[PDB]
Amino acid sequence: RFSVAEHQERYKEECQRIFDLQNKVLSSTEVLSTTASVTSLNSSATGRCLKIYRTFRDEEGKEYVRCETVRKPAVIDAYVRIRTTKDEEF
């Protein structure tokens, strides 16, 4: 609890141990056998997906509407961020 030496000593010993472990891992000629478990994020914090109905005009005369759903939360974030920016860009 005496940071003067306790904090300095423990931090130094931890750093030395980490360095020794890294050196041992680098020096191993042991052959390892041919994705590690990770937390799986939900489709965003809100658990939502992004859809988009949209109108266009075909050759001759037509007015078809396309509804497209984006379930990729990565595509979502980048998509929305531009609109919110373009909404403020006016």
Next chain:
Amino acid sequence: PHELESQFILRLPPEYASTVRRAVQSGHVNLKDRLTIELHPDGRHGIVRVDRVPLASKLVDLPCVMESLKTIDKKTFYKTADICQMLVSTEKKFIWNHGITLPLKNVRKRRFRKTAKKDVEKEVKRLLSTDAEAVSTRWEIIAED
């Protein structure tokens, strides 16, 4: 101008690797006729022909980054290029999980932090391009559907 040289690693089957190694250490131009490399317009597929025998190749991405370092006195080493690709001969398939050295195997699965790699943004660009043609847009929360 100067263009940075592009070095990659070629991995061969072990008998063909022994013949290519013997022909390289010999040093004649006979090796030049014997060893050819044809890279297909896929960009991730090829043939390596050892002694006119075709072998099927894939250009894969390596999980670590290697750097070639040349020297004249073996005390100071100058970085010459970055190596990140290997033309193993015999997308997710074009990514190699293991590293070249023995301590690094499946470095991607175990010794790599899983912050992220990359795809999602090219899809975003395509989505914005499709969005451009819109008059009435409809988007909702969505649940278990």
